[PDB]
Symmetry: C2
Subunit: 97 residues, 2 copies
Amino acid sequence: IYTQLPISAANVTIFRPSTFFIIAQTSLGLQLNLQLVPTMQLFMQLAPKLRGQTCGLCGNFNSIQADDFRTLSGVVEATAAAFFNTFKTQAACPNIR
Amino acid sequence: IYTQLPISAANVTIFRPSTFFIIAQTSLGLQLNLQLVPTMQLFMQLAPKLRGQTCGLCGNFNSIQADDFRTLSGVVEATAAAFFNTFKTQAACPNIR
Ligand SMILES: [Ca+2]
Ligand SMILES: [Ca+2]
């Protein structure tokens, strides 16, 4: 549903600090800063309580850079593209090299 | 949720033909024209399939004006105010004389 900021939804509040940014704060310790001018950029912030618990393109948040390229299969890839291609959501998406 | 027109929701479509009117059409044979400029006025149109079945401030749609002041109790009131006050939704609302 195309809504209108600001919103106080279930556990999440989204608002516009200015005409350039959109900020979405959750009660789980996750904040999103979204720059829309000139191009979209994302700054995600995670609370310290989620250290070693998350996983995805942003790593597992355990202060170790080496294992940030570890896929869901349990091995650490050697290149950024190989680890990147394992987090697609659709089959038709190309394999980036 | 504060939405933006047009909306195609379940069994209803709401749009803005102009800056003065909002039109909401349902699949049950009901249509609402809402004039917003200069003051809010309503025109409801009902399909013939609902003749003799509805009931409210707009009558029972049975081509008889005599029973249009019939309340849910079962009798026809004599004044517009007495029948009008029986279709309140809250107890604290005043009784119009
Ligand atoms: Ca890590
Ligand atoms: Ca009638």
